[PDB]
Ligand binder design. Structure first.
Ligand SMILES: [Zn+2]
Ligand SMILES: [Zn+2]
Lengths: 66, 45, 45
Protein backbone atom coordinates (compact mmCIF):
# COMPACT_ATOMS: atom_id res chain seq x y z
CA UNK A 1 0.00 0.00 0.00
CA UNK A 2 2.81 2.26 1.09
CA UNK A 3 6.45 1.27 1.77
CA UNK A 4 6.79 -0.67 5.05
CA UNK A 5 8.70 0.98 7.85
CA UNK A 6 10.74 -2.13 8.67
CA UNK A 7 11.95 -5.20 6.85
CA UNK A 8 9.65 -7.98 8.04
CA UNK A 9 12.38 -10.58 8.48
CA UNK A 10 15.29 -8.74 10.11
CA UNK A 11 13.96 -5.36 11.23
CA UNK A 12 16.33 -2.96 9.44
CA UNK A 13 14.58 0.33 8.69
CA UNK A 14 13.70 0.59 5.00
CA UNK A 15 10.92 3.13 5.09
CA UNK A 16 13.28 6.07 4.51
CA UNK A 17 14.82 4.70 1.31
CA UNK A 18 11.82 4.60 -1.03
CA UNK A 19 12.24 8.10 -2.46
CA UNK A 20 15.97 7.54 -2.98
CA UNK A 21 15.22 4.32 -4.88
CA UNK A 22 12.82 5.90 -7.41
CA UNK A 23 15.27 8.71 -8.18
CA UNK A 24 18.11 6.23 -8.91
CA UNK A 25 15.89 4.46 -11.47
CA UNK A 26 15.40 7.68 -13.43
CA UNK A 27 19.19 7.98 -13.74
CA UNK A 28 19.20 4.54 -15.56
CA UNK A 29 20.68 2.36 -12.82
CA UNK A 30 19.61 -1.26 -12.73
CA UNK A 31 17.57 -2.52 -9.79
CA UNK A 32 20.36 -4.65 -8.33
CA UNK A 33 22.82 -1.75 -8.47
CA UNK A 34 20.34 0.74 -6.96
CA UNK A 35 19.80 -1.55 -3.97
CA UNK A 36 23.59 -1.95 -3.68
CA UNK A 37 24.10 1.82 -3.47
CA UNK A 38 21.55 2.06 -0.66
CA UNK A 39 23.59 -0.54 1.32
CA UNK A 40 20.75 -3.09 1.48
CA UNK A 41 23.02 -6.11 1.49
CA UNK A 42 20.98 -8.97 2.99
CA UNK A 43 18.37 -10.31 0.61
CA UNK A 44 15.63 -10.07 3.25
CA UNK A 45 15.92 -6.28 3.05
CA UNK A 46 16.17 -6.34 -0.76
CA UNK A 47 12.80 -8.08 -1.28
CA UNK A 48 11.09 -5.24 0.67
CA UNK A 49 12.10 -2.51 -1.73
CA UNK A 50 12.34 -4.52 -4.95
CA UNK A 51 8.89 -6.09 -4.70
CA UNK A 52 6.78 -3.41 -3.03
CA UNK A 53 3.83 -2.14 -5.09
CA UNK A 54 2.86 1.49 -4.51
CA UNK A 55 -0.92 1.52 -4.54
CA UNK A 56 -1.34 4.74 -2.51
CA UNK A 57 -0.70 6.78 -5.67
CA UNK A 58 -3.84 5.20 -7.11
CA UNK A 59 -6.01 5.70 -4.00
CA UNK A 60 -5.21 9.41 -3.79
CA UNK A 61 -6.74 10.03 -7.24
CA UNK A 62 -10.19 9.55 -5.69
CA UNK A 63 -11.54 13.01 -4.85
CA UNK A 64 -11.73 13.61 -1.06
CA UNK A 65 -15.22 12.91 0.29
CA UNK A 66 -14.98 15.85 2.69
CA UNK B 1 -49.13 6.72 -32.76
CA UNK B 2 -47.06 8.12 -29.90
CA UNK B 3 -44.04 6.07 -28.82
CA UNK B 4 -45.02 3.57 -26.12
CA UNK B 5 -42.76 2.38 -23.27
CA UNK B 6 -42.45 -1.38 -22.74
CA UNK B 7 -40.19 -1.39 -19.67
CA UNK B 8 -36.56 -1.30 -18.54
CA UNK B 9 -33.67 -3.56 -19.60
CA UNK B 10 -30.61 -3.90 -17.29
CA UNK B 11 -27.42 -2.61 -18.94
CA UNK B 12 -24.13 -4.50 -18.78
CA UNK B 13 -21.47 -2.19 -17.36
CA UNK B 14 -18.84 -0.92 -19.86
CA UNK B 15 -20.97 -2.05 -22.82
CA UNK B 16 -21.88 0.41 -25.56
CA UNK B 17 -25.08 1.50 -23.78
CA UNK B 18 -23.50 2.23 -20.39
CA UNK B 19 -22.80 5.82 -19.39
CA UNK B 20 -19.21 4.87 -18.46
CA UNK B 21 -18.19 3.81 -21.99
CA UNK B 22 -17.32 7.44 -22.77
CA UNK B 23 -16.19 9.83 -20.00
CA UNK B 24 -12.47 9.01 -20.59
CA UNK B 25 -9.73 8.66 -17.96
CA UNK B 26 -10.14 12.14 -16.44
CA UNK B 27 -13.84 11.76 -15.58
CA UNK B 28 -13.89 8.10 -14.45
CA UNK B 29 -12.20 9.00 -11.16
CA UNK B 30 -14.87 11.63 -10.50
CA UNK B 31 -17.64 9.06 -10.96
CA UNK B 32 -15.91 6.91 -8.26
CA UNK B 33 -15.30 4.12 -10.78
CA UNK B 34 -12.15 2.13 -10.82
CA UNK B 35 -10.27 1.93 -14.14
CA UNK B 36 -9.30 -1.69 -13.38
CA UNK B 37 -13.00 -2.66 -13.27
CA UNK B 38 -13.65 -4.20 -16.68
CA UNK B 39 -17.41 -4.62 -16.43
CA UNK B 40 -19.24 -7.59 -17.85
CA UNK B 41 -21.85 -7.69 -15.09
CA UNK B 42 -25.22 -6.22 -14.16
CA UNK B 43 -26.44 -4.35 -11.10
CA UNK B 44 -29.76 -5.59 -9.70
CA UNK B 45 -31.04 -4.06 -6.43
CA UNK C 1 -27.92 18.92 16.20
CA UNK C 2 -26.07 16.25 14.22
CA UNK C 3 -23.29 17.14 11.79
CA UNK C 4 -23.50 15.78 8.24
CA UNK C 5 -21.50 16.12 5.04
CA UNK C 6 -22.59 16.48 1.42
CA UNK C 7 -21.31 13.70 -0.82
CA UNK C 8 -20.84 16.10 -3.77
CA UNK C 9 -19.90 19.59 -2.56
CA UNK C 10 -18.74 18.74 1.01
CA UNK C 11 -20.83 21.49 2.66
CA UNK C 12 -21.50 20.80 6.34
CA UNK C 13 -24.92 21.29 7.96
CA UNK C 14 -27.28 19.74 10.48
CA UNK C 15 -30.67 18.05 10.24
CA UNK C 16 -33.35 17.16 12.79
CA UNK C 17 -35.87 14.31 12.31
CA UNK C 18 -38.41 16.20 10.13
CA UNK C 19 -36.32 17.55 7.21
CA UNK C 20 -35.84 15.71 3.87
CA UNK C 21 -32.61 13.84 3.17
CA UNK C 22 -30.71 16.09 0.75
CA UNK C 23 -27.91 18.62 0.56
CA UNK C 24 -28.98 22.24 0.90
CA UNK C 25 -26.29 23.40 -1.54
CA UNK C 26 -26.53 21.06 -4.55
CA UNK C 27 -29.49 18.79 -3.81
CA UNK C 28 -27.33 15.65 -3.71
CA UNK C 29 -29.20 12.74 -2.13
CA UNK C 30 -26.21 10.82 -0.72
CA UNK C 31 -24.94 12.16 2.63
CA UNK C 32 -22.62 10.99 5.41
CA UNK C 33 -22.45 11.38 9.19
CA UNK C 34 -19.60 13.47 10.57
CA UNK C 35 -16.90 12.14 12.90
CA UNK C 36 -17.89 11.73 16.57
CA UNK C 37 -16.86 14.24 19.23
CA UNK C 38 -15.09 11.62 21.38
CA UNK C 39 -11.35 11.03 21.27
CA UNK C 40 -10.15 7.75 19.73
CA UNK C 41 -7.03 5.94 21.00
CA UNK C 42 -5.00 3.19 19.35
CA UNK C 43 -2.12 1.17 20.80
CA UNK C 44 0.09 1.40 17.69
CA UNK C 45 0.70 -2.35 17.72
ZN1 LIG D 1 15.90 -7.41 5.36
ZN1 LIG E 1 -23.97 19.82 -1.80
Amino acid sequence: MIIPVRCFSCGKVVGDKWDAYLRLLEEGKQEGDALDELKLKRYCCRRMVLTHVDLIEKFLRYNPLE
Amino acid sequence: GNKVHIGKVPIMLRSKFCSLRTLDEVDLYKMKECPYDMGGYFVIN
Amino acid sequence: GVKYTCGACAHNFSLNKSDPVRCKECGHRVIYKARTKRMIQFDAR
